[PDB]
Design a protein around this ligand. Structure first.
Ligand SMILES: CC(C)(Nc1ccc(Cl)cc1)C(=O)Nc1cccc(-c2csc(C(=N)N)c2)c1
Ligand SMILES: CC(C)(Nc1ccc(Cl)cc1)C(=O)Nc1cccc(-c2csc(C(=N)N)c2)c1
Lengths: 5, 236, 236, 5
């Protein structure tokens, strides 16, 4: 999964 | 509200204690109580709120993904009928997740966003609104799915417009908003080219503004810039 | 019981799904529902029950330790008065932990232990009874602390007596019981010499019986033997 | 902390 903050 | 009898300051203190104890459900309940006192949130308090619910919903999302994967396999040609239990339990977790998202969106709508006038607060809350509609979109399948997606898009877009007018390109809120809106494009809106363009332009504009920053601000901005690069590497 | 309307087999299925999703509170609720159907538990089912509650109470214990540490520091000479919040929140977590322990002990008393006649079931449940009294002892400070400790000791002792009569020295339940009773001696009963003697004798008697085992049984037994050695290394 | 199972 891609990075989110 | 079961926190209605507790002092605002005590709720904030206990949210920090809950964080130290990795008790994020408690942390979120304490911060919901603090929001419901009706006063605006300081920068630190906004981040306590976001940390709490991001950890709670993050666990729900991970569980939902495991269960959805099991459910899809139970539905492949050749599978042995296992009854309604996998669907039921995925539904249970999904409903709990939707409830958490609805709770956060409710706090933003009553009344955090409408009182948020400074860019750092307003962009932060609108990013949150986009994020929690995005999590609703991840599990949505019904008549409302397109409207949920457009609600996420609209919140992200308003946050983007404010951030480009009012914050420098290295501002970590601006960077994290762009990171997440880029993921929205890739994973939710079936717009990988938009996702890649946004991540690249955000990265390059931030790079060019790093020279203005202190050492500590540089560390904060370059951390999120690395996440943009990480996603670009995943996608290209 | 909110699980009263669900089939026993569906509860067991969903406990396994909850485990895969790392949703241990759900897992424990499903297994409590299964126990409350009133039938005895198979070996697999007993271990689902124990895995669920061990994970739940393990998280509570870790949180309690963090909060207790903060509380003791707030009480050192030189500390700035922080108000009642640290104590209150430690108390909250402590009460939730005691509730989980009381729930498990209640399941064992109504009526798992009294129907457990085979050594593998009876020793397993009596070990659990000692374990959950041990967790109550870890947080106990009142008029009842000695009685809680003696309840743990008594359950462990009955389990030990049965295990020595009815199981080989490499039986993993027997080994895990001795491991935990040894920790009871060291950490709860202020009996480090008893803890060390028990761990060493258990290890040596198991070593001498390994030659009787298949490759897979050998792996199971030597895993717990390594934990005995690990503790002995910590303690000597 | 010591090991338990
Ligand atoms: C590491 C990370 C994820 N970067 C980030 C970047 C963008 C956005 Cl929109 C959100 C996060 C982060 O958290 N930055 C951060 C910024 C400001 C305050 C706090 C904070 C105060 S207090 C507190 C706490 N956990 N007690 C945290 C934390
Ligand atoms: C690794 C460990 C901790 N060794 C141990 C040793 C002693 C004691 Cl009293 C307790 C545990 C363990 O778990 N052994 C184990 C033994 C028998 C069945 C299952 C099981 C069936 S199903 C299932 C599941 N998690 N789905 C697990 C697991």
């Amino acid at each position: 999964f891609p990075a989110t903050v | 509200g079961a926190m209605g009898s507790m002092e605002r300051a005590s709720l904030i203190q206990k949210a920090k204690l809950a964080e130290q104890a990795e008790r994020y459900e408690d942390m979120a309940a304490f911060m919901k109580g603090a929001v419901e006192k009706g006063e605006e949130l300081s920068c630190e308090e906004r981040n306590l709120l976001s940390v709490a619910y991001k950890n709670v919903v993050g666990g729900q999302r991970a569980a939902w993904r495991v269960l959805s994967s099991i459910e899809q396999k139970s539905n492949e040609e050749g599978s042995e009928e296992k009854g309604p239990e996998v669907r039921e339990y995925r539904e249970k977790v999904e409903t709990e997740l939707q409830g958490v998202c609805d709770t956060v969106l409710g706090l933003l709508d009553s009344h955090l966003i409408k009182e948020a006038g400074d860019a750092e607060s307003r962009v932060f809350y609108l990013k949150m609104k986009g994020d929690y509609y995005r999590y609703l979109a991840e599990v949505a399948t019904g008549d409302d799915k397109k409207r949920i997606i457009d609600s996420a898009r609209s919140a992200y877009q308003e946050a983007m417009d404010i951030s480009k007018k009012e914050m420098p390109p290295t501002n970590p809120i601006r960077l994290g908003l762009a990171l997440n809106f880029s993921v929205f494009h890739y994973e939710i809106a079936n717009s990988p080219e938009e996702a890649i363009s946004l991540a690249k332009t955000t990265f390059d504009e931030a790079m060019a503004d790093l020279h203005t920053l202190s050492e500590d601000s540089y560390k904060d901005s370059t951390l999120i810039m690395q996440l943009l690069r990480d996603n670009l590497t995943l996608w290209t």
